[PDB]
Amino acid sequence: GSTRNGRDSQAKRLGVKRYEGQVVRAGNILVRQRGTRFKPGKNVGMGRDFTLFALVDGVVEFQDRGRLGRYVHVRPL
């Protein structure tokens, strides 16, 4: 009587970090994600681990472009 399971890894706290309409500053992280569930749009960069982050001060805007994917933009103020 013994279990060969019992393992699991720490949760990674993924997901969107700033929702549409939120005021962000340049460098603010907007999305933590595995792969390109969201794609960087206007004024949004993407780091080696697919993290989306704002390139300028402004306002977050989401856009669903169908087969082109979902995008995150930052509209400057």
Partner RNA sequence: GAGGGGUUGUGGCGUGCCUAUUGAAGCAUGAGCCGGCGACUCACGGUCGUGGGCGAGCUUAAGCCGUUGAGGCGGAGGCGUAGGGAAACCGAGUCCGAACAGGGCGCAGCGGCCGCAAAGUCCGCGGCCGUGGACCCGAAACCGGGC
Partner RNA sequence: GUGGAGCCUGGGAGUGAGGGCGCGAGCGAUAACGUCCGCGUCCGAGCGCGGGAACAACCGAGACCGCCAGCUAAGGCCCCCAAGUCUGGGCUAAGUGGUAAAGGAUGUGGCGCCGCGAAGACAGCCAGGAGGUUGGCUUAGAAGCAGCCAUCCUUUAAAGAGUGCGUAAUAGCUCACUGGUCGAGUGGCGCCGCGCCGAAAAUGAUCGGGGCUUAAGCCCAGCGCCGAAGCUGCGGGUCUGGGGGAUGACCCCAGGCGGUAGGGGAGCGUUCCCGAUGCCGAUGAAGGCCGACCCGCGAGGGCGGCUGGAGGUAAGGGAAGUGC
Partner RNA sequence: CGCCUCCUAAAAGGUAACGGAGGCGCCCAAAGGUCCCCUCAGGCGGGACGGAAAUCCGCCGGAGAGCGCAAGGGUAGAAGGGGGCCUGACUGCGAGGCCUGCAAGCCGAGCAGGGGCGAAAGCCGGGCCUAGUGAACCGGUGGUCCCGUGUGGAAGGGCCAUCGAUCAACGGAUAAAAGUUACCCCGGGGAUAACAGGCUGAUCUCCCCCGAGCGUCCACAGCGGCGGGGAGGUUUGGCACCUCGAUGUCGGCUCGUCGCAUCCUGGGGCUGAAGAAGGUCCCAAGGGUUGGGCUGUUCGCCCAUUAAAGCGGCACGCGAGCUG
Partner RNA sequence: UCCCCCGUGCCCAUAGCGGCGUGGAACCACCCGUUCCCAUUCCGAACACGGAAGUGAAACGCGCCAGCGCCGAUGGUACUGGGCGGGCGACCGCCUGGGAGAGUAGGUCGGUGCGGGGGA
What residues make contact with Mg ion under the rule CB under 5 A?
2, 4-7, 10-11, 15-16, 48, 61, 73
User: Among candidates 29, 34, 27, 33, which has minimal Cα distance to 56?
Assistant: 27
- Which positions touch RNA (CB under 7 A)? 1-17, 25-29, 32-37, 45, 47-51, 53, 55, 63-69
* Least distance between RNA and beta carbon 77 (Å): 14
- CB contact at 8 A, 34 and 14: yes
Q: How far is the CB of 26 from RNA (least distance, A)?
A: 4
Helices (H), 1-77: none
